[PDB]
Amino acid sequence: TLLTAPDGTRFRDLDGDGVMAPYEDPRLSERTADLVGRLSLAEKAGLMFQTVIEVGADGELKEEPGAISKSGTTEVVVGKAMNHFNVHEIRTARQAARWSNRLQELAESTPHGIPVTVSTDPRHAFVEGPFSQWPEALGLAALDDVDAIRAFADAARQEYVAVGIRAALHPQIDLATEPRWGRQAQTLGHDADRVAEFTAAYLQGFQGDELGSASVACTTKHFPGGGPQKDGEDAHFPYGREQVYPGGYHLRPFREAIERGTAAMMPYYGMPEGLVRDGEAIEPVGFGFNRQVITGLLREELGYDGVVVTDWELVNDNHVGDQVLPARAWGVEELTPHERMERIIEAGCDQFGGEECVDVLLDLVASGRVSEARIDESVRRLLLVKFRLGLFDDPYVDEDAAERIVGRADLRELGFRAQAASVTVLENRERDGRPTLPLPVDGPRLRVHVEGMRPEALDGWADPAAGPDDADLAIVRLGAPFEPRSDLFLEAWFHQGSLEFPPGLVHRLRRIADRCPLVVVVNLDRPAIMTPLVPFAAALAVDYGSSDAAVLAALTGRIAPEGRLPVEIPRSMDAVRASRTDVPSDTEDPVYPLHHGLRIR
């Protein structure tokens, strides 16, 4: 629909007039102002919803309910005037870019062809496609290198933009002050100052200093800080709704994100319990419904005028599977969807995440509950980002370029080096004068008993042992322990509760160590109580979501492990329960303190 105007301009014709209205004019900055004037009420409402969308298996628009999404794409894009979606499973780069182009063409069919903003959750961590593979964010914190964060952000920005992903549901700049929290791995530790520095590098790396045609707009989360979860239980669950502040910091990275112009901001599900800020009691309700936090603090006190999108599904219950996913309507559970949605608008948010109930919003306007003037305030913010990203002018991508950019060998090597070098060594006992690590790359052909790691990963370097008895050493990878739960939906997908290893698992490792030197590598999605392992492991290390090969690269010193603990490892669960969930690494006598890491040679 690229046309040549009577005055000479080349412009995208989005309403089809054959003429170039101002909002369709690329010369202009003010084209939001012009487009707000032309949009129907249903178009304004469509803008204030963002939900999951699925890529068709062969690059086609999914027109049927999927694993997660429930409406057809034409339904949401055309029938509901929606144009913000969080994309899920991507198989190939070509697939994603072709589907993106198809999606953007469909979006032209709307009365004013508002382009689609496709966002995504973090999708580069090896422990969860075609993207470069990295450790989890906590691994970058273990490297404690501002340049590695610049490098990640630019790498991921190149890969996102190649397939038409122009929004990030991140950085996640919550602080991991509560060790039982099952979302620590996606943080950058708990040092508010350090995290704030990473935040500037992250937003600059993804957004630039000004949003443009190669930018990714960031949705910084989870405002005002999701880390201090009461008893470590997470606000995804109706038993984990509360955040508590017994130590009276978490806001500080978000002030940086505001100073840096993060294009959007996501309040957490969390409900603050017993919080007083400057002598003023804070309403005990989910931050998305909390006018004090969104309007008083974020809008007025901090001066933030970017987009505010709720966390996912605050308004309606669901029924995926055959039991009930509850709306995360924490502290307002007794409100109906209409009343929830109204309360979110009143709190000062602009967009409902994980919802597509545009008719509910049109209801409120027709009921007189919400003014079109109020809607215009949010429509203005949402439209701005689309215009500043360049999406009104060129939302299309190159399929062939996409196949070459995404997972490019140099980005894969960056990410693989991050995986290996973020490995953090905790104990490294000395065999006969030689430390256990690095393991011999030369030396003898070793027989290695492996558990938790693929034996195929030894290929070329060592022979798999049938067991500890015929092994020169054992390499055991373990996840951090947790309380296995499955009473509610998603519980099986979270790692919550106690950080202690089962005693029979500890004994089995001890039986291994009685026969051969034992190297334990723990995937530190949470700070496992390492203490019972310390008396018999020949070496103790942690990774933050590293492949078997990257772990082996670190353990042999091929890529030296440079990680230092970005959170402490508590000595016992007793020490955890005695600590304050909002205070960083404040357990007493941690078995490995904050910043601990050993160099190997």
Automatic annotation (TrEMBL):
EC supergroup of this enzyme: hydrolase
Catalytic activity: Hydrolysis of terminal, non-reducing beta-D-glucosyl residues with release of beta-D-glucose
Residue intervals of the Glycoside hydrolase family 3 C-terminal domain: 464-598
UniProt keyword annotations, A-Z: Glycosidase, Hydrolase, Signal
Top-level taxonomic group: Bacteria
InterPro entries: Cellulose_Degrad_GH3 (IPR051915), GH (IPR017853), Glyco_hydro_3_C (IPR002772), Glyco_hydro_3_C_sf (IPR036881), Glyco_hydro_3_N (IPR001764), Glyco_hydro_3_N_sf (IPR036962)
GO annotation, biological process: glucan catabolic process
Claim: Signal is one of the keywords in the record: yes
GO molecular function, one term: beta-glucosidase activity
The protein's Enzyme Commission number: 3.2.1.21
PANTHER family in alphabetical order: LYSOSOMAL BETA GLUCOSIDASE, PERIPLASMIC BETA-GLUCOSIDASE-RELATED
Family statement: Belongs to the glycosyl hydrolase 3 family.
Protein name: beta-glucosidase
Source organism per UniProt: Clavibacter michiganensis
Protein's gene: bglX_1
